[PDB]
């Protein structure tokens, strides 16, 4: 499972600040892995701190709780 | 419209994402969270473009490659170990 | 009031990974300045943190709740 | 040692701009949140340098240089404006 390379390219394609900026294949690719590993980062964390705290399911408070790390890692 | 379109794609790749890590972990994820980390996950996009494009200009270059990516993948010493060892693979054709 | 280049340029050099890395005066010059401002962004930032807590002073738990976004910020 | 004087010298330099900002902003620091900001400062020195190696090794330079150091104050948008415009009169030599 993962996301599609046409739809990485067209999110940061989004916010170039420069129309000339272009991505290789290969750094596409790579950018699919990382995106992903990101989100599962993000949901395993969620997933951590709703353990420790005993929660019932992750909800939005014990995902606040992880994203200052997650994207300090990130 | 376009960013609609794209928020979306986003959300149903996050949901199945989560999913799998629900059913792994036998944990539930609110639709509040799912939603939330779609969200994340968007504007996420817009830092990781940035940096790319900064880190490509940076070696004088308009085409973002490989080693910009990995670079960007720097932070965490387990996440370069992944971003190297996974560049490789993709880069055995 | 500032950090002094000699000091800066210790600090860096004992984390660099290759004895081969260098730092050039200018660069070194930018890096002072901009230790200066992280250091500067803290205490600031603190101080907010404890006027709008109506705390006597900053003390750690005021500054922890302000350091996860300075570290995004830089 | 060698480490506990650069941290004591950091220390001293922490304290000092603290007591500006007490001064100014008419609020004290603790003791013990001066000390805080030193180690957070030391230790921060430990990521802009590998970073800037980073930086100029990606531009296949061995010598950190001007550019390296704005790459890495790109962070914020203000935080861009202050070393672009302080990057000049350091240059005005």
């Given amino acids: 499972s993962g996301f599609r390379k046409e739809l990485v390219s067209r999110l940061l394609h989004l916010h170039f600040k420069d129309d000339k900026t272009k991505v290789s294949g290969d750094a596409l690719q790579l950018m699919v892995e990382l995106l992903k590993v990101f989100v599962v980062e993000a949901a395993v964390r969620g997933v951590r701190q709703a353990q420790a705290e005993d929660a019932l399911r992750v909800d939005v408070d014990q995902l606040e709780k992880v994203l200052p790390q997650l994207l300090l890692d990130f | 419209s376009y960013q609609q379109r794209l928020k979306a794609a986003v959300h149903y790749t996050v949901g199945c994402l989560c999913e799998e890590v629900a059913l792994d972990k036998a944990m539930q994820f609110s639709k509040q969270t799912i939603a939330a ?57």
Avoid at chain 2, 37 to 65: G, P, V
Avoid at chain 2, 70 to 87: G, H, V, W
């Fill in chain 2, 37 to 93: 980390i779609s969200e994340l996950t968007f504007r996420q996009c817009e830092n990781f473009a940035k940096d790319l494009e900064m880190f490509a200009r940076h070696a004088k270059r308009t085409t973002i490659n490989t080693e910009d990516v990995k670079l960007l993948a720097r932070r965490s010493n387990s996440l370069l170990k992944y971003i190297t060892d996974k560049s490789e693979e993709i880069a055995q054709a």
